[PDB]
Amino acid sequence: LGIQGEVENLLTDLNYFNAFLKEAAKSRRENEVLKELVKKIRKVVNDAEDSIDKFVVEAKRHDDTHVARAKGVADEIKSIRERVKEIRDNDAYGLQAITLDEERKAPVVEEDDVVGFDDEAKTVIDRLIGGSDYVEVVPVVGMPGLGKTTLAYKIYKDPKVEYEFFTRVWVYVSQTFKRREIFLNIISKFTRNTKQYDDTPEDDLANEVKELLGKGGKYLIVLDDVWTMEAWDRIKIAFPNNGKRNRVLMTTRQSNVAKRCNDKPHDLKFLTKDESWELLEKKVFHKEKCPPELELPGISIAEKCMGLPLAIVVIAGALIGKGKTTREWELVAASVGEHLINRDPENCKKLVQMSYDRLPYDLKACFLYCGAFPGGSQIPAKKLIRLWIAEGFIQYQGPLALEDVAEDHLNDLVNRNLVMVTQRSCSGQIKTCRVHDMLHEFCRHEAMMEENLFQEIKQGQERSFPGKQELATYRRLCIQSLIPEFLSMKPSGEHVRSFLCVGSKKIDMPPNEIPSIPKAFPLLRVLDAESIKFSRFSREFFKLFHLRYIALSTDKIKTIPADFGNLWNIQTLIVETQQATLDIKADIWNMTRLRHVCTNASATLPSTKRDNLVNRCLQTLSTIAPECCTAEVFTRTPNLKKLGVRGKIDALLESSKDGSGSGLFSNIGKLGCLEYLKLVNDTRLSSKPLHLPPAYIFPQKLKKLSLVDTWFEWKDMSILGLLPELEVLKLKENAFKGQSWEQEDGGFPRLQVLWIERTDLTSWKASSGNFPRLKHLALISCDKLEELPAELADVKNLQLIELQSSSESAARSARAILKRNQEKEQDGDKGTGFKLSIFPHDLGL
Amino acid sequence: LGIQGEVENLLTDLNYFNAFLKEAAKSRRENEVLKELVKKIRKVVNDAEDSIDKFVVEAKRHDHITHVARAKGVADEIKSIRERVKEIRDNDAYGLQAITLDDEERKAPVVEEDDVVGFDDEAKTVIDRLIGGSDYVEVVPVVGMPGLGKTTLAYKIYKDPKVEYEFFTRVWVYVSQTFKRREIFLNIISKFTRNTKQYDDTPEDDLANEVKELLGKGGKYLIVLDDVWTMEAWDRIKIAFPNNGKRNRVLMTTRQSNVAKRCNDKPHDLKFLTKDESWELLEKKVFHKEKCPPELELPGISIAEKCMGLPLAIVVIAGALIGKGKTTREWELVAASVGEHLINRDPENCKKLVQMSYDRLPYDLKACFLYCGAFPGGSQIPAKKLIRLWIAEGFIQYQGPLALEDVAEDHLNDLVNRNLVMVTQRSCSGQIKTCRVHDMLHEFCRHEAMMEENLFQEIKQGQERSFPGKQELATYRRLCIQSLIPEFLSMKPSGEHVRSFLCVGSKKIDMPPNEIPSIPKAFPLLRVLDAESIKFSRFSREFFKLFHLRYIALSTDKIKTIPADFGNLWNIQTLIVETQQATLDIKADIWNMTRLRHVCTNASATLPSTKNLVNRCLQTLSTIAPECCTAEVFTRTPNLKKLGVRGKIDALLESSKDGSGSGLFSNIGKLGCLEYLKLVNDTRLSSKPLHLPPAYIFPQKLKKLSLVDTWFEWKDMSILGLLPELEVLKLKENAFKGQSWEQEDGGFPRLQVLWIERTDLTSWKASSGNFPRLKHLALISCDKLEELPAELADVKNLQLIELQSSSESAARSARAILKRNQEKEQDGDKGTGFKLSIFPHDLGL
């Protein structure tokens, strides 16, 4: 095809243009002509990929009117080629400024009136005074503008620290530094003739600092703003390990650098609601107090700063200028975020840009994507990761899976402290993450204005929904509320690649506005509408040939139709169905890029037997029917890592007709990559109690098991103990039935978490070696339990136990177990941080 | 079809050129060739956005032979613009090279030490403030407009015998627009020790610590931070200033009030020279020791008044008078052209100082500040009229949550805080009401906006500058005419590129009937018509063809109804019809105005039928008929913040006796954004006076109320006390009827200003619970009041009560309150700064 030829020439220009965008993004350009040049080529690049993906889809449909649509694509390619040719000619003067080719400003912090750091300084000073006799690093970690340097300078000037450490050196490390000037700066603290070392190498300069520091007692060295582990390695030569309890206090935005200097870094606190108000009040009114007319909007101002001292200091600058009237302060309270970033591009914007610009080029889009969700809202890590892959941000072709590559992208953001973690799974994996309010405003301002990554759709007080001229340039739409009325305007976005319904309350699509999304946005790759209840599938949903992510709630539909299989590019499938049976009639076995099938009903998979391929990318098959756990299905998914079965566990374990007792559970053991297995039972009216198949038929690589309502006997825990890799066991809704549970010796070699909900169990007995690696034990709503085994005190890995609706004798046994554990720790064993939690606290007085 | 595509091609070029102008305006280089390139590109850009706007209104009107001809004309005009764009790139390639690429001044200014006139009192005021104060480091920022004499006063303060005697060490520091903090610290160190060579490897952190040590060797220090421009610049320098509790002082000079407020919440705004002192300086600078000859004394005082007490203007004209010789005729010629000598012919001294504040202004604030020069010199600019003009011209670009009025008001606050715009009047709440630009800045605005950027051009008939011809009108962008409007309009002017027509005159003129349609005929692309100084006897069909109109203000004595064809101007934001008629009936389809923001009139406006769509941008409806305050009208306007009612308001407060509670006043309570409400009565022949509806019917977010001739009994004032957020209440004559005024306990929880005029009040009883926040209480022409309640003296927040020609008992009560308050202050009670003013001094003294 000649269209392929002009596409290939277009791709060559795209490689140059993308190289220009990457090169221009490596350093922030202050020239407006280059700013508009970057935006112009960034746009023509975006329309270029959208045009080629149209040709790719149309060529795929051609290989597997049609001619008129292909002709229209060719016309788009010709128009794009005319655009790139004029860019290379008219704007060539701007390209030459990027095809071919610094001030050290140490920060200034508060000396007097430091608010809320009285106990953080006390904690860190205690860690500086005590410890080993070797040079120990005490890192203070935090997000941009948290107050690390303010705390470090508070410690540096503390009366106890000054007396403790005879020699105190403050060194300003930064993103860029020269080791020679660092050593000469430290040398200048001690001797005035620094011209003495003009030709002395850095090797002997470091030994010179060794001599200066070792002449007295301890030394404390505050390495401010360390950004890399290489910087600490290169500078630490000057610091001798002469066994004098020497300390190196360090401040950094990087948790990975902090961990390598000390395995327990000191994460700095956020100011409380009263400390934020106290700080803002002091900054604005100085010694005087806030008049009562301004206290009400002022308190809201300090609470909207989310306890970040940088935001409170920046906002107080605007309040000082505006005045002391009530009306002005409510205007600020309604636009706290804008005052931080847009109105102040020199305090908050430049401080955040110090971390954003140091990001890798691929991680920048991942970080800005977190701003699509509402400010202060919890972002599920699994949801965020699946959106990154579906958007194309995760480009990777190594041995690992894309989930594990996007996960350490997120863990890199958390290490950089650009993303905060609110909940962690039992295995330590990130579960729920949230971006700070000012960083979120930076994500909004950068993505919507500077990069056109995504756009908010709203009609607030005065602003309205975007017009036809704006939607023609929009690439991603994120919307929280008023979705049905937004779609009632009949919008038309030709360049829209994603539609994120980030609203928290589930809405219902009217039957007339159900097909609005597929027609408004024909190039939709991502449709995150799990907060929307669709009652019907419309045929236009099956014309989204570019679709890769689709999440949707439903209350009525039961079957995914066969026309849904026309979307060969789909990766993630989330259908939160209120019903009980979800017959997936779509040909999901021909989606070579399919990765996840998540649902809550009993999904019935289509027939695998009859392209001659295998679903090598499919990783999750959650809550499918037990009838579909066939041998052919598990052959089609060699790389499955999570499996879920719901309903009729009776048919999962029943023996076959060939005489062998191994049932459908035997095929599950053939999944060599399986880590998570979930079994949920529904048929309480069945006359046959369920019996667990022997452990040699289980998947031997299973690391997490969840059972609900299965009515297994407690004697089957003995064969759950034979699993070599099981680490998390959660049992809910009397999944185990019986009044007595007596453990056999041994078993559970590496189980770490045991979660128990309501069951008719009354007695529990065990031996010393039953839980060699148990760390967390939880028991909820089991009012029939009499007592807990005393052998739990021998669990060396025990850290926390939670009991609800438990007997007082169980609390007494917990007290004895804790007391024995404390006695063991007093023999030299390190403390495990034992904790006990009984909810509600009003129970038992 | 392809014409719209060609508009996209032109728009792409316009984005590049607009960025070119934005980047070029960031650096005023000496390259003259680039100065002519930016002027040529700017003219093409202006002629391009005009052609694009012509295309926009043509497309809107179309969606027929005349339309086809106009479309062909637009296509030809666009083609000419495109061809002009190609000439820019073909010939001025080098000019674009200089801006897409990138790349002595720290000499302290000279100020006279001797012959300083008019600063004896101001210096003593600041000295008495430096000597006193607290025990920690206090800053005393002197702040004023460019050329005011801050450095002259600061050097005078720096050299008095009292300042020199009291302070241990005094240091002069010249901070500037751009400075290096390292050099400042090395200069302070250079004064204590001359061996500054030894700090080459010493970082700025240890330099600031060295300045701490040097200043801390003794007692007080006074440091004159000259010309500080930023909040950050003060923070980075104050780290070198020790705080040892010895009453250390810092004397800062700055053009920024917001920077001054941060250092001290009570900035010392420098005063302007009086008319006597201005003449004294001029005669001392021109004639030196010799006195002015008597023949030159009369013109000399005339030019001294032209400077408006600014020393910089006096110094500049002094050089002009020296060069121009000493003759009476020449001096009178200078007095007629003072502005020319300030800026046009002396760019060496005056213009550069003005440009220091101007080039630091953000790009959006530059056009906002230059627009303030359109109004006549010394004239008073209303703040609400100025703000609406900025929005109409497009200078305010905003997408956040605030309203465009609040953003533009913040722009006005930024200009005032930069001392580029004076504030002459302030509202009760402290909002800026009337502003005026200083004379030197007005001439700079006119020079920059006529001879450099072509923002606006004035029309006048002087000695040599007659009315401009057709060639000059072909380049005029905005028209500003003060007088001789009918004479200018009689010649049938033809300005096809005029975007504004500001009648900046003060006295109203009646437009001759035969010249009424001349304004719309002359400038078809009129975007702003500020004809509020012109009385129109009739509307014309030519007015309804100004499809680009956004701001329209006009006075009238004959027009009673706005015609329906007025609604053809869908772009209108502000609609002002100041009519002397009793009623105004708006037949125009104002609901179709999607961007309508303000409708203001003095008559009882009768709104048209609303018959889904919502006017989200409408903020003000001003005075309307009571019968039009329906729940349907308020549905279409949810963001209304000011409402006015005029006429027979008994149709508003009447009870719906049919059985429902749907009184027209109850619909007002459904407006959640209302903040100010006005009611004016016209009909007095009701059998009984009206009574207020219950307070829960009032809008809860109401913060200001105003009633006229409503004849409300004083008993129904306590219900106004149940308004939670009310802050200002004002009443004109006969708004309240009766002689006895009594209040319940509590009420008025947030009242701050109360206004009463010419009521029948004679007896007044109140309680301390009704005034928790009251600050202003005026009783103009309420001479029948006997005595003020004693509870008023207990109100801490009370500020001023002003009465003239009051009763003898009222004067005696004022004397008793003043005497008792003075006695209490002498006994240790904290003073509230309460003042009483009596004019003239013949009575009451």
Ligand SMILES: Nc1ncnc2c1ncn2[C@@H]1O[C@H](COP(=O)(O)OP(=O)(O)OP(=O)(O)O)[C@@H](O)[C@H]1O
């Ligand atoms: N407890 C506090 N009281 C008053 N001001 C504070 C406090 N903590 C921080 N600040 C102010 O907040 C701003 C940012 O704090 P700080 O300089 O310590 O940032 P940081 O966490 O070191 O920043 P970076 O991310 O650049 O390393 C500074 O202007 C500082 O004065």
Ligand SMILES: Nc1ncnc2c1ncn2[C@@H]1O[C@H](COP(=O)(O)OP(=O)(O)OP(=O)(O)O)[C@@H](O)[C@H]1O
């Ligand atoms: N009271 C005065 N008597 C005589 N000359 C004065 C007086 N005040 C100021 N001047 C003169 O006015 C001119 C400008 O004043 P000055 O240099 O003090 O300006 P400024 O307020 O510091 O301005 P900028 O905002 O540019 O810093 C100088 O030449 C100075 O000598």
